[PDB]
Amino acid sequence: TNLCPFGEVFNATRFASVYAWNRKRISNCVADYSVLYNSASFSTFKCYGVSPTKLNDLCFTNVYADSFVIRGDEVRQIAPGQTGKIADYNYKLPDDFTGCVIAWNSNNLDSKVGGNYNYLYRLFRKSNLKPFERDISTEIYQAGSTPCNGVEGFNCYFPLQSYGFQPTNGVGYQPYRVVVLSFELLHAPATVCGPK
Amino acid sequence: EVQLLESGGGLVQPGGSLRLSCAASGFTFSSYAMNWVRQAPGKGLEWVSVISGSGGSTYYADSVRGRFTISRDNSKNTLYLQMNSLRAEDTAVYCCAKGYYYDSSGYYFREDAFDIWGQGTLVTVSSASTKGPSVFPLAPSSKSTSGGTAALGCLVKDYFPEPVTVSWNSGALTSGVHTFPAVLQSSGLYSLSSVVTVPSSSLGTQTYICNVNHKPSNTKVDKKVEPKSC
Amino acid sequence: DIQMTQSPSAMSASVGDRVTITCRASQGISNYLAWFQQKPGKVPKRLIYAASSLQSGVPSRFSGSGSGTEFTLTISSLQPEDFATYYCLQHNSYPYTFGQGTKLEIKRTVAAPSVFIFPPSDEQLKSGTASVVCLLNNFYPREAKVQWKVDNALQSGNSQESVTEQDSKDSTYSLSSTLTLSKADYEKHKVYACEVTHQGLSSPVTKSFNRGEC
Ligand SMILES: *[C@@H]1O[C@H](CO[C@@H]2O[C@@H](C)[C@@H](O)[C@@H](O)[C@@H]2O)[C@@H](O[C@@H]2O[C@H](CO)[C@@H](O)[C@H](O)[C@H]2NC(C)=O)[C@H](O)[C@H]1NC(C)=O
């Protein structure tokens, strides 16, 4: 009865920016998703392909726990078939996504008076992300026709924008920590089951 | 525009039943959890029940557990609260409130709740029977004069159910009138009184009449307040 | 059961004052806290919904802060339509629980009540019951103490009082205390007295009458 180290992912000290979203591979452990679902702690816990009410009656080969931080109003974008800055340039879920999206407000931790600039998100990109793609390039985005020559200015933009995380913001603009649980299913022995 | 319209309240004796409904319009009803919140007369707010959008999860306050049952017909966009084994303490105004996004697939914005409330409907549990009040005069005297002005009034005693309406001189007199809130006596019947301060110099010349109406019993009484008969 | 403690229970302030209401939770409720306003006879209206997030259509003078166990609703500059009762609500864990409420009243100068006493009407006596009424007219603050004395014997458990809402013109309260006796017990005694103590009085005011006298 090895329990899955979800405390490492959820109760982590620091979370990654969405463009540099972090991933934790989870295998050979017993996962109690039910405790999380009924936790009164997370503001969002929506599943796709599975039903959260009795999903710990299931087994998978591996579980990917992606973690990052976004703005509250952007939590709606962490879902299959969504458009927006985050879903296009930061974190894309596939149309056939099978897994859960968990988000909780972290204003008390990831805010700072006058703005916390630790958390950034990609604002420009030549094309949309493929599902589960991670792009950490800091190349000067060329919006115009003349090359940027590695210097930014007119039609030459730095691709990452910073959240100005002040605790005085509205909810839509407060920091939310997000964990996406993806359930990978290979032709191999299934190593992550629930309590039964 | 989000709208909640309650209906189904009324008078009922203890041990009786009553089924409140809340019709919703202007949003995806089947996607949000719904709440019932009651308020006893002159007291605070009390949460009663929550049901999930799927209808699968229901939670109740302990004070109504096992007696009330929350449910919903999403096809009719309607929420229901079935109240059985009703006790007198359940007398309250019952409001229907929109909760957080709670789907068949999980919950989304658990902080955003109670943004929209229904107009509320009144549930009065009592073993009393509809009775009209007696209107007695509180007559002015030397014991009720206070420096040029004298106070007179009407005692509207032993009625059920609420409300009673009280005017003075068929609406001609309004200045300095105080019609007190009804008190619930131990007998189960209500009682209030309406007083007014007037210039005491006019107690012999001006006629003062209080008009009392209690519709539920078919009672109208116009009572003249005669000053101290001595 | 999470228990929400609001402070103060009542509060009087003038227009323009900065008003601060506190709500403490017995346990942690994260940010699942809302503030509602209730005018008399109306439906609760939400003012703040995520402990600090203002509701759309609510003036910016209202603001919410705090988290964990202590929370604060603040009105920067009071306004006439801000005199109401304010409730905090945790919706973190079942059962959801409200605070005891905070009624925000208008502040005025102290005013002592005009006290009057009304013996039972002859008609009511004919009915078989007697009610003596004591009226306290147009005072402030609302705190007042009424004692009934029948033949100098202090009465308890046979009277009920009710007070009006703060008057629209002078913001003064009026209270009525009604003492109920049987006709039999009413005719057993002579002196009926109502003793009022109020902030606006240096010494208690007693108004009394003798049964069947003028
Ligand atoms: C996330 O952490 C909470 C609380 O963890 C405690 O506080 C941390 C800062 C650190 O000091 C830890 O060592 C502490 O345990 C967990 O909540 C508690 O969980 C235990 C069982 O694990 C339970 O008995 C307690 O009642 C819980 N108390 C509270 C207030 O939550 C929580 O389980 C952790 N979540 C995960 C996914 O690991």
Side-chain angles (χ1 to χ4, degrees), chain C residues 44-83:
Chain C
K45 164 181 186 184
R46 194 170 70 172
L47 297 182
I48 294 168
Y49 58 93
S52 59
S53 210
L54 183 123
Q55 163 94 21
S56 55
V58 172
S60 46
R61 53 188 184 264
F62 297 82
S63 63
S65 62
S67 54
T69 51
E70 229 120 347
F71 306 79
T72 279
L73 168 64
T74 308
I75 307 175
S76 61
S77 179
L78 256 198
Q79 287 299 293
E81 75 276 23
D82 293 350
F83 289 102

mmCIF file of all heavy atoms in Angstrom, chain C residues 44-83:
data_model
loop_
_atom_site.group_PDB
_atom_site.id
_atom_site.type_symbol
_atom_site.label_atom_id
_atom_site.label_comp_id
_atom_site.label_asym_id
_atom_site.label_seq_id
_atom_site.Cartn_x
_atom_site.Cartn_y
_atom_site.Cartn_z
ATOM 1 N N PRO C 44 -31.565 39.312 0.944
ATOM 2 C CA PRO C 44 -30.115 39.521 1.046
ATOM 3 C C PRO C 44 -29.507 39.826 -0.314
ATOM 4 O O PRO C 44 -29.803 39.161 -1.309
ATOM 5 C CB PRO C 44 -29.609 38.186 1.601
ATOM 6 C CG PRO C 44 -30.737 37.647 2.367
ATOM 7 C CD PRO C 44 -31.988 38.088 1.651
ATOM 8 N N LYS C 45 -28.655 40.848 -0.354
ATOM 9 C CA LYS C 45 -27.947 41.234 -1.568
ATOM 10 C C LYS C 45 -26.450 41.091 -1.337
ATOM 11 O O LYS C 45 -25.923 41.595 -0.341
ATOM 12 C CB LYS C 45 -28.295 42.677 -1.960
ATOM 13 C CG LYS C 45 -27.347 43.318 -2.964
ATOM 14 C CD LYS C 45 -27.768 44.746 -3.277
ATOM 15 C CE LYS C 45 -26.911 45.348 -4.380
ATOM 16 N NZ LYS C 45 -27.251 46.779 -4.645
ATOM 17 N N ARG C 46 -25.761 40.416 -2.258
ATOM 18 C CA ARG C 46 -24.340 40.152 -2.066
ATOM 19 C C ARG C 46 -23.519 41.404 -2.337
ATOM 20 O O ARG C 46 -23.753 42.127 -3.312
ATOM 21 C CB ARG C 46 -23.864 39.001 -2.958
ATOM 22 C CG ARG C 46 -22.493 38.451 -2.552
ATOM 23 C CD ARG C 46 -22.124 37.163 -3.287
ATOM 24 N NE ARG C 46 -21.849 37.362 -4.708
ATOM 25 C CZ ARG C 46 -21.369 36.422 -5.521
ATOM 26 N NH1 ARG C 46 -21.096 35.208 -5.061
ATOM 27 N NH2 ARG C 46 -21.150 36.701 -6.796
ATOM 28 N N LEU C 47 -22.555 41.657 -1.459
ATOM 29 C CA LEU C 47 -21.608 42.754 -1.593
ATOM 30 C C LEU C 47 -20.206 42.283 -1.918
ATOM 31 O O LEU C 47 -19.530 42.892 -2.748
ATOM 32 C CB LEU C 47 -21.555 43.579 -0.310
ATOM 33 C CG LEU C 47 -22.843 44.281 0.084
ATOM 34 C CD1 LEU C 47 -22.607 45.079 1.349
ATOM 35 C CD2 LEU C 47 -23.314 45.172 -1.042
ATOM 36 N N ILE C 48 -19.738 41.232 -1.253
ATOM 37 C CA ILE C 48 -18.385 40.726 -1.477
ATOM 38 C C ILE C 48 -18.436 39.208 -1.477
ATOM 39 O O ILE C 48 -19.154 38.616 -0.669
ATOM 40 C CB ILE C 48 -17.425 41.273 -0.408
ATOM 41 C CG1 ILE C 48 -17.307 42.786 -0.590
ATOM 42 C CG2 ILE C 48 -16.080 40.569 -0.470
ATOM 43 C CD1 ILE C 48 -16.649 43.477 0.521
ATOM 44 N N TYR C 49 -17.709 38.561 -2.398
ATOM 45 C CA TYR C 49 -17.905 37.124 -2.524
ATOM 46 C C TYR C 49 -16.673 36.252 -2.379
ATOM 47 O O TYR C 49 -16.837 35.045 -2.167
ATOM 48 C CB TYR C 49 -18.581 36.765 -3.854
ATOM 49 C CG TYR C 49 -17.878 37.185 -5.116
ATOM 50 C CD1 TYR C 49 -16.998 36.324 -5.756
ATOM 51 C CD2 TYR C 49 -18.142 38.415 -5.702
ATOM 52 C CE1 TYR C 49 -16.373 36.690 -6.930
ATOM 53 C CE2 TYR C 49 -17.525 38.790 -6.878
ATOM 54 C CZ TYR C 49 -16.639 37.922 -7.487
ATOM 55 O OH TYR C 49 -16.014 38.287 -8.654
ATOM 56 N N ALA C 50 -15.464 36.777 -2.513
ATOM 57 C CA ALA C 50 -14.351 35.874 -2.262
ATOM 58 C C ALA C 50 -13.459 36.419 -1.163
ATOM 59 O O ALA C 50 -12.234 36.465 -1.308
ATOM 60 C CB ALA C 50 -13.556 35.625 -3.532
ATOM 61 N N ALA C 51 -14.085 36.847 -0.070
ATOM 62 C CA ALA C 51 -13.425 37.471 1.068
ATOM 63 C C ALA C 51 -12.881 38.848 0.712
ATOM 64 O O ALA C 51 -12.746 39.703 1.591
ATOM 65 C CB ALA C 51 -12.309 36.575 1.613
ATOM 66 N N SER C 52 -12.607 39.104 -0.565
ATOM 67 C CA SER C 52 -11.998 40.377 -0.918
ATOM 68 C C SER C 52 -12.449 40.879 -2.282
ATOM 69 O O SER C 52 -12.108 42.001 -2.673
ATOM 70 C CB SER C 52 -10.473 40.259 -0.892
ATOM 71 O OG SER C 52 -10.010 39.266 -1.789
ATOM 72 N N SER C 53 -13.229 40.074 -3.000
ATOM 73 C CA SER C 53 -13.626 40.408 -4.358
ATOM 74 C C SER C 53 -14.978 41.114 -4.338
ATOM 75 O O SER C 53 -15.982 40.536 -3.900
ATOM 76 C CB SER C 53 -13.677 39.151 -5.222
ATOM 77 O OG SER C 53 -13.365 39.471 -6.575
ATOM 78 N N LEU C 54 -15.005 42.342 -4.844
ATOM 79 C CA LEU C 54 -16.225 43.133 -4.883
ATOM 80 C C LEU C 54 -17.198 42.592 -5.925
ATOM 81 O O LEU C 54 -16.800 42.098 -6.982
ATOM 82 C CB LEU C 54 -15.887 44.593 -5.184
ATOM 83 C CG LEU C 54 -17.038 45.597 -5.193
ATOM 84 C CD1 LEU C 54 -16.791 46.731 -4.211
ATOM 85 C CD2 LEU C 54 -17.251 46.135 -6.595
ATOM 86 N N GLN C 55 -18.489 42.698 -5.619
ATOM 87 C CA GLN C 55 -19.528 42.254 -6.535
ATOM 88 C C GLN C 55 -19.826 43.350 -7.551
ATOM 89 O O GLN C 55 -19.831 44.540 -7.223
ATOM 90 C CB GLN C 55 -20.798 41.883 -5.766
ATOM 91 C CG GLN C 55 -22.055 41.794 -6.626
ATOM 92 C CD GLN C 55 -22.338 40.385 -7.120
ATOM 93 O OE1 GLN C 55 -21.853 39.409 -6.551
ATOM 94 N NE2 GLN C 55 -23.121 40.275 -8.192
ATOM 95 N N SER C 56 -20.071 42.938 -8.790
ATOM 96 C CA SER C 56 -20.408 43.887 -9.841
ATOM 97 C C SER C 56 -21.685 44.640 -9.503
ATOM 98 O O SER C 56 -22.690 44.040 -9.106
ATOM 99 C CB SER C 56 -20.568 43.148 -11.166
ATOM 100 O OG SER C 56 -21.519 42.108 -11.032
ATOM 101 N N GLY C 57 -21.643 45.962 -9.661
ATOM 102 C CA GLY C 57 -22.773 46.804 -9.328
ATOM 103 C C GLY C 57 -22.807 47.286 -7.899
ATOM 104 O O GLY C 57 -23.836 47.815 -7.461
ATOM 105 N N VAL C 58 -21.721 47.123 -7.163
ATOM 106 C CA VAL C 58 -21.628 47.516 -5.760
ATOM 107 C C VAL C 58 -20.621 48.651 -5.669
ATOM 108 O O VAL C 58 -19.496 48.502 -6.157
ATOM 109 C CB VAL C 58 -21.202 46.337 -4.866
ATOM 110 C CG1 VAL C 58 -20.931 46.810 -3.451
ATOM 111 C CG2 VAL C 58 -22.277 45.254 -4.876
ATOM 112 N N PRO C 59 -20.975 49.787 -5.067
ATOM 113 C CA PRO C 59 -20.054 50.929 -5.048
ATOM 114 C C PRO C 59 -18.719 50.563 -4.423
ATOM 115 O O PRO C 59 -18.620 49.669 -3.579
ATOM 116 C CB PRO C 59 -20.797 51.984 -4.217
ATOM 117 C CG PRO C 59 -21.861 51.234 -3.500
ATOM 118 C CD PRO C 59 -22.243 50.096 -4.393
ATOM 119 N N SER C 60 -17.678 51.259 -4.879
ATOM 120 C CA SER C 60 -16.307 50.931 -4.513
ATOM 121 C C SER C 60 -15.961 51.307 -3.078
ATOM 122 O O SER C 60 -14.868 50.959 -2.615
ATOM 123 C CB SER C 60 -15.351 51.608 -5.493
ATOM 124 O OG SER C 60 -15.727 52.958 -5.705
ATOM 125 N N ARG C 61 -16.847 52.014 -2.367
ATOM 126 C CA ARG C 61 -16.586 52.302 -0.960
ATOM 127 C C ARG C 61 -16.572 51.030 -0.129
ATOM 128 O O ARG C 61 -15.878 50.967 0.892
ATOM 129 C CB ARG C 61 -17.626 53.280 -0.411
ATOM 130 C CG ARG C 61 -19.075 52.875 -0.638
ATOM 131 C CD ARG C 61 -19.997 54.011 -0.216
ATOM 132 N NE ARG C 61 -21.414 53.677 -0.311
ATOM 133 C CZ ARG C 61 -22.181 53.978 -1.357
ATOM 134 N NH1 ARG C 61 -21.665 54.613 -2.402
ATOM 135 N NH2 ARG C 61 -23.463 53.643 -1.362
ATOM 136 N N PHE C 62 -17.296 50.003 -0.573
ATOM 137 C CA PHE C 62 -17.287 48.709 0.087
ATOM 138 C C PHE C 62 -16.042 47.937 -0.303
ATOM 139 O O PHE C 62 -15.651 47.909 -1.471
ATOM 140 C CB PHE C 62 -18.530 47.903 -0.288
ATOM 141 C CG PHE C 62 -19.816 48.532 0.166
ATOM 142 C CD1 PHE C 62 -20.406 49.547 -0.568
ATOM 143 C CD2 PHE C 62 -20.429 48.110 1.332
ATOM 144 C CE1 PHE C 62 -21.580 50.128 -0.147
ATOM 145 C CE2 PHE C 62 -21.606 48.690 1.758
ATOM 146 C CZ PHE C 62 -22.182 49.698 1.017
ATOM 147 N N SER C 63 -15.424 47.302 0.685
ATOM 148 C CA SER C 63 -14.223 46.526 0.428
ATOM 149 C C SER C 63 -14.108 45.413 1.456
ATOM 150 O O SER C 63 -14.543 45.559 2.602
ATOM 151 C CB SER C 63 -12.989 47.430 0.437
ATOM 152 O OG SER C 63 -12.804 48.008 1.713
ATOM 153 N N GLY C 64 -13.516 44.305 1.041
ATOM 154 C CA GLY C 64 -13.367 43.153 1.913
ATOM 155 C C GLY C 64 -11.925 42.710 1.956
ATOM 156 O O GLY C 64 -11.208 42.797 0.958
ATOM 157 N N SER C 65 -11.504 42.231 3.125
ATOM 158 C CA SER C 65 -10.124 41.802 3.305
ATOM 159 C C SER C 65 -10.077 40.683 4.331
ATOM 160 O O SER C 65 -11.067 40.381 5.003
ATOM 161 C CB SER C 65 -9.223 42.947 3.761
ATOM 162 O OG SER C 65 -9.647 43.437 5.023
ATOM 163 N N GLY C 66 -8.897 40.086 4.459
ATOM 164 C CA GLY C 66 -8.666 39.021 5.412
ATOM 165 C C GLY C 66 -8.724 37.651 4.761
ATOM 166 O O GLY C 66 -9.091 37.488 3.595
ATOM 167 N N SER C 67 -8.346 36.647 5.552
ATOM 168 C CA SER C 67 -8.387 35.253 5.107
ATOM 169 C C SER C 67 -7.947 34.386 6.279
ATOM 170 O O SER C 67 -7.405 34.877 7.278
ATOM 171 C CB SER C 67 -7.518 34.960 3.881
ATOM 172 O OG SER C 67 -6.189 35.388 4.099
ATOM 173 N N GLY C 68 -8.175 33.082 6.138
ATOM 174 C CA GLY C 68 -7.848 32.165 7.208
ATOM 175 C C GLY C 68 -8.925 32.151 8.269
ATOM 176 O O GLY C 68 -9.893 31.387 8.160
ATOM 177 N N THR C 69 -8.779 33.000 9.289
ATOM 178 C CA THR C 69 -9.754 33.065 10.364
ATOM 179 C C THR C 69 -10.379 34.435 10.570
ATOM 180 O O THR C 69 -11.501 34.501 11.062
ATOM 181 C CB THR C 69 -9.132 32.599 11.689
ATOM 182 O OG1 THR C 69 -7.900 33.295 11.915
ATOM 183 C CG2 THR C 69 -8.876 31.096 11.655
ATOM 184 N N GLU C 70 -9.713 35.525 10.204
ATOM 185 C CA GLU C 70 -10.272 36.855 10.409
ATOM 186 C C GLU C 70 -10.526 37.543 9.078
ATOM 187 O O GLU C 70 -9.702 37.465 8.150
ATOM 188 C CB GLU C 70 -9.375 37.744 11.275
ATOM 189 C CG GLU C 70 -10.129 38.428 12.404
ATOM 190 C CD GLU C 70 -9.607 38.076 13.780
ATOM 191 O OE1 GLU C 70 -8.824 37.110 13.891
ATOM 192 O OE2 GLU C 70 -9.988 38.764 14.756
ATOM 193 N N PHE C 71 -11.679 38.214 8.998
ATOM 194 C CA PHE C 71 -12.110 38.919 7.803
ATOM 195 C C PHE C 71 -12.729 40.243 8.205
ATOM 196 O O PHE C 71 -13.244 40.403 9.314
ATOM 197 C CB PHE C 71 -13.123 38.096 7.005
ATOM 198 C CG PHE C 71 -12.643 36.724 6.663
ATOM 199 C CD1 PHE C 71 -12.666 35.712 7.605
ATOM 200 C CD2 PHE C 71 -12.191 36.439 5.393
ATOM 201 C CE1 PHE C 71 -12.217 34.457 7.299
ATOM 202 C CE2 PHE C 71 -11.757 35.178 5.077
ATOM 203 C CZ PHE C 71 -11.766 34.186 6.031
ATOM 204 N N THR C 72 -12.697 41.189 7.274
ATOM 205 C CA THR C 72 -13.154 42.542 7.547
ATOM 206 C C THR C 72 -13.897 43.106 6.349
ATOM 207 O O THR C 72 -13.392 43.072 5.222
ATOM 208 C CB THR C 72 -11.992 43.458 7.926
ATOM 209 O OG1 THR C 72 -11.671 43.249 9.304
ATOM 210 C CG2 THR C 72 -12.359 44.915 7.705
ATOM 211 N N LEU C 73 -15.109 43.582 6.603
ATOM 212 C CA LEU C 73 -15.852 44.403 5.664
ATOM 213 C C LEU C 73 -15.678 45.860 6.068
ATOM 214 O O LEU C 73 -15.718 46.191 7.257
ATOM 215 C CB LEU C 73 -17.331 44.010 5.657
ATOM 216 C CG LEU C 73 -18.324 44.928 4.957
ATOM 217 C CD1 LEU C 73 -18.017 44.975 3.488
ATOM 218 C CD2 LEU C 73 -19.737 44.458 5.184
ATOM 219 N N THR C 74 -15.450 46.728 5.084
ATOM 220 C CA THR C 74 -15.194 48.134 5.367
ATOM 221 C C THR C 74 -15.965 49.013 4.403
ATOM 222 O O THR C 74 -15.954 48.777 3.189
ATOM 223 C CB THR C 74 -13.708 48.462 5.278
ATOM 224 O OG1 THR C 74 -12.976 47.537 6.090
ATOM 225 C CG2 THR C 74 -13.461 49.875 5.769
ATOM 226 N N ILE C 75 -16.636 50.018 4.956
ATOM 227 C CA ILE C 75 -17.235 51.103 4.189
ATOM 228 C C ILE C 75 -16.396 52.353 4.418
ATOM 229 O O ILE C 75 -16.281 52.833 5.553
ATOM 230 C CB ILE C 75 -18.697 51.341 4.589
ATOM 231 C CG1 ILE C 75 -19.490 50.033 4.497
ATOM 232 C CG2 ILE C 75 -19.312 52.432 3.717
ATOM 233 C CD1 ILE C 75 -20.911 50.148 4.984
ATOM 234 N N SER C 76 -15.813 52.885 3.341
ATOM 235 C CA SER C 76 -14.907 54.024 3.474
ATOM 236 C C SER C 76 -15.658 55.271 3.922
ATOM 237 O O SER C 76 -15.260 55.939 4.885
ATOM 238 C CB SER C 76 -14.196 54.283 2.149
ATOM 239 O OG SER C 76 -15.133 54.599 1.130
ATOM 240 N N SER C 77 -16.732 55.616 3.213
ATOM 241 C CA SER C 77 -17.562 56.771 3.532
ATOM 242 C C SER C 77 -19.012 56.316 3.579
ATOM 243 O O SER C 77 -19.558 55.887 2.554
ATOM 244 C CB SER C 77 -17.387 57.890 2.507
ATOM 245 O OG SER C 77 -18.212 58.997 2.825
ATOM 246 N N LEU C 78 -19.629 56.400 4.760
ATOM 247 C CA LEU C 78 -21.006 55.953 4.903
ATOM 248 C C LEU C 78 -21.934 56.767 4.014
ATOM 249 O O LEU C 78 -21.652 57.910 3.644
ATOM 250 C CB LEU C 78 -21.485 56.082 6.344
ATOM 251 C CG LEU C 78 -21.570 54.796 7.154
ATOM 252 C CD1 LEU C 78 -22.455 55.011 8.378
ATOM 253 C CD2 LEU C 78 -22.074 53.651 6.293
ATOM 254 N N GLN C 79 -23.080 56.181 3.713
ATOM 255 C CA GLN C 79 -24.052 56.801 2.834
ATOM 256 C C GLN C 79 -25.431 56.458 3.364
ATOM 257 O O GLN C 79 -25.606 55.443 4.046
ATOM 258 C CB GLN C 79 -23.898 56.306 1.391
ATOM 259 C CG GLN C 79 -22.679 56.866 0.671
ATOM 260 C CD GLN C 79 -22.698 58.381 0.559
ATOM 261 O OE1 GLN C 79 -23.536 58.954 -0.143
ATOM 262 N NE2 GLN C 79 -21.758 59.038 1.238
ATOM 263 N N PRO C 80 -26.435 57.275 3.056
ATOM 264 C CA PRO C 80 -27.783 56.981 3.566
ATOM 265 C C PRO C 80 -28.276 55.580 3.253
ATOM 266 O O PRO C 80 -28.776 54.895 4.155
ATOM 267 C CB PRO C 80 -28.628 58.073 2.906
ATOM 268 C CG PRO C 80 -27.677 59.218 2.788
ATOM 269 C CD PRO C 80 -26.341 58.625 2.479
ATOM 270 N N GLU C 81 -28.121 55.111 2.019
ATOM 271 C CA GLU C 81 -28.616 53.778 1.690
ATOM 272 C C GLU C 81 -27.715 52.674 2.223
ATOM 273 O O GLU C 81 -27.932 51.504 1.886
ATOM 274 C CB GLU C 81 -28.786 53.617 0.172
ATOM 275 C CG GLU C 81 -27.492 53.443 -0.631
ATOM 276 C CD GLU C 81 -26.799 54.754 -0.983
ATOM 277 O OE1 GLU C 81 -27.019 55.771 -0.282
ATOM 278 O OE2 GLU C 81 -26.047 54.764 -1.987
ATOM 279 N N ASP C 82 -26.730 53.011 3.050
ATOM 280 C CA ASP C 82 -25.865 52.016 3.663
ATOM 281 C C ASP C 82 -26.315 51.615 5.057
ATOM 282 O O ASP C 82 -25.713 50.715 5.654
ATOM 283 C CB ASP C 82 -24.432 52.542 3.730
ATOM 284 C CG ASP C 82 -23.819 52.701 2.368
ATOM 285 O OD1 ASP C 82 -24.440 52.229 1.391
ATOM 286 O OD2 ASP C 82 -22.729 53.310 2.280
ATOM 287 N N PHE C 83 -27.359 52.246 5.586
ATOM 288 C CA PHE C 83 -27.878 51.874 6.895
ATOM 289 C C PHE C 83 -28.745 50.640 6.718
ATOM 290 O O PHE C 83 -29.858 50.723 6.189
ATOM 291 C CB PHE C 83 -28.643 53.037 7.515
ATOM 292 C CG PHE C 83 -27.752 54.160 7.954
ATOM 293 C CD1 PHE C 83 -27.629 55.305 7.184
ATOM 294 C CD2 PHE C 83 -26.998 54.051 9.111
ATOM 295 C CE1 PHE C 83 -26.794 56.333 7.574
ATOM 296 C CE2 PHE C 83 -26.159 55.079 9.504
ATOM 297 C CZ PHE C 83 -26.058 56.220 8.734
#
